Amino acid sequence: ATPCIKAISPSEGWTTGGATVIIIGDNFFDGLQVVFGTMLVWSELITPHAIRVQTPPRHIPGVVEVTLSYKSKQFCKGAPGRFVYTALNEPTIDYGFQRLQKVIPRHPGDPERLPKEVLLKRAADLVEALYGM
Amino acid sequence: ATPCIKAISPSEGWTTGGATVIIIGDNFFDGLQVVFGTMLVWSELITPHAIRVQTPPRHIPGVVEVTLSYKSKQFCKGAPGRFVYTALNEPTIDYGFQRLQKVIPRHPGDPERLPKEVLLKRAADLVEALYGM
Ligand SMILES: [Cl-]
Ligand SMILES: [Cl-]
């Protein structure tokens, strides 16, 4: 009757945290906590087979073990969930945004530096016109 | 032993579709089909309590019922999942990436899901071919 993790969805998120994640498994109950590496968060019980959490921030990117905890007892250490944190400022991601900043078309009224949301919006507009539909 | 939906997560998404939704319930099996409104969608069994799907696009905002089907028999009509399609708001980083994941050209030997850095590298390659000095 111990809580067990069978799957986690999504399995990745940004280091800034705040993503909704569903943990699927067995023997869940109200009050169960979830630990991402060392970062503990509380959960919402959906059914005994699913709980919902918001990811905690993590200082560094990388793979973490996801385990469960209740009254400081750890569960799932022998079969932990896997969750991957990515940093928006990882050098290869950042270099991609720097490339886009130089060639994304600027529209009247734009700020001097286009925000990343806009770089991505217009890159997708352009790629959709090439390969979309 | 009747398949039953207890919840869906998330229960809203954009009209453009392509979001991962987990359908949580009881008595799920391989070959059970998922219907969003009137659209049959591809699904994958995670456990007998969880199915994963990708939302189909829907041109018009609003609620649809999620029901299940097997051998043309319908389940869950009396207690369906309710999924709300939502008109697009301001561009976000994640939405921009979701758009690129759908249209960035794939190469032989690519992972099913391109990493963010690869989405950007390829988007930058294409945009530099349009506007690069
Ligand atoms: Cl543009
Ligand atoms: Cl993506």
XYZ file of all heavy atoms in Angstrom, chain A residues 12, chain B residues 93-102 113-116 119, ligand 2:
142
model
N 9.523 17.540 -18.417
C 10.544 18.580 -18.492
C 9.893 19.924 -18.244
O 8.670 20.062 -18.365
C 11.238 18.567 -19.865
C 10.399 19.079 -21.022
C 11.075 18.815 -22.393
O 12.318 18.958 -22.499
O 10.362 18.450 -23.353
N 6.594 32.330 -24.391
C 7.709 31.454 -24.786
C 7.278 30.020 -25.095
O 7.657 29.441 -26.132
C 8.797 31.401 -23.683
C 9.397 32.774 -23.496
C 9.870 30.401 -24.051
C 10.089 33.222 -24.667
N 6.504 29.409 -24.205
C 6.129 28.013 -24.416
C 5.252 27.811 -25.633
O 5.364 26.802 -26.314
C 5.429 27.395 -23.192
C 6.378 27.240 -22.003
O 7.596 27.371 -22.226
O 5.912 27.014 -20.868
N 4.354 28.751 -25.878
C 3.490 28.601 -27.031
C 4.338 28.717 -28.309
O 4.151 27.955 -29.248
C 2.416 29.665 -27.024
C 1.458 29.455 -28.182
C 0.738 28.250 -28.315
C 1.307 30.425 -29.164
C -0.137 28.040 -29.400
C 0.425 30.227 -30.244
C -0.278 29.052 -30.359
O -1.124 28.883 -31.442
N 5.291 29.643 -28.319
C 6.168 29.807 -29.476
C 6.933 28.529 -29.753
O 7.042 28.036 -30.910
N 7.449 27.931 -28.697
C 8.136 26.653 -28.890
C 7.214 25.561 -29.369
O 7.615 24.724 -30.172
C 8.855 26.211 -27.603
C 10.218 26.835 -27.436
C 10.510 27.596 -26.325
C 11.210 26.655 -28.402
C 11.738 28.175 -26.156
C 12.471 27.227 -28.227
C 12.729 27.986 -27.110
N 5.981 25.529 -28.861
C 5.038 24.493 -29.298
C 4.772 24.657 -30.800
O 4.696 23.670 -31.560
C 3.739 24.630 -28.511
C 2.689 23.576 -28.813
C 1.324 23.940 -28.193
O 0.292 23.854 -28.850
N 1.332 24.373 -26.939
N 4.633 25.911 -31.239
C 4.436 26.136 -32.672
C 5.642 25.617 -33.470
O 5.472 24.969 -34.478
C 4.233 27.615 -32.992
C 2.910 28.183 -32.457
C 2.878 29.711 -32.649
N 2.730 30.031 -34.078
C 2.960 31.233 -34.584
N 3.346 32.218 -33.781
N 2.795 31.458 -35.882
N 6.848 25.938 -33.045
C 8.030 25.483 -33.810
C 8.155 23.967 -33.815
O 8.532 23.380 -34.828
C 9.314 26.093 -33.245
C 9.428 27.606 -33.425
C 10.700 28.029 -32.684
C 9.579 27.906 -34.950
N 7.842 23.332 -32.690
C 7.885 21.852 -32.627
C 7.024 21.236 -33.744
O 7.405 20.253 -34.361
C 7.424 21.358 -31.237
C 7.639 19.837 -30.969
C 9.113 19.512 -30.845
O 9.678 18.826 -31.706
N 9.764 20.042 -29.799
N 5.867 21.828 -34.026
C 5.016 21.357 -35.090
C 5.515 21.592 -36.541
O 5.246 20.802 -37.437
C 3.612 21.947 -34.920
C 2.635 21.460 -35.946
C 1.216 21.955 -35.632
C 0.200 21.550 -36.715
N -1.216 21.885 -36.295
N 10.874 14.290 -30.329
C 10.692 15.661 -29.851
C 12.003 16.412 -29.966
O 12.997 16.022 -29.332
C 10.248 15.633 -28.388
C 9.279 16.726 -28.022
C 8.793 16.608 -26.579
N 8.959 17.877 -25.872
C 8.090 18.883 -25.930
N 6.987 18.762 -26.664
N 8.317 20.007 -25.259
N 12.048 17.487 -30.763
C 13.313 18.180 -30.890
C 13.552 18.973 -29.610
O 12.626 19.535 -29.043
C 13.347 19.107 -32.128
C 13.034 18.415 -33.468
C 12.939 19.444 -34.610
C 14.089 17.342 -33.799
N 14.799 19.009 -29.149
C 15.179 19.879 -28.022
C 15.008 21.376 -28.368
O 15.134 21.743 -29.534
C 16.660 19.590 -27.845
C 16.882 18.232 -28.477
C 15.908 18.161 -29.622
N 14.803 22.222 -27.365
C 14.593 23.644 -27.596
C 15.728 24.263 -28.392
O 15.499 25.112 -29.262
C 14.492 24.378 -26.265
C 13.328 23.941 -25.387
C 12.016 24.058 -26.117
C 10.858 23.791 -25.138
N 10.901 22.381 -24.664
N 15.233 23.303 -32.086
C 14.185 24.159 -32.650
C 14.731 25.555 -33.025
O 14.466 26.050 -34.125
C 12.997 24.282 -31.688
C 12.239 23.012 -31.391
C 11.163 23.310 -30.348
C 11.612 22.469 -32.684
Cl 8.045 21.990 -27.546
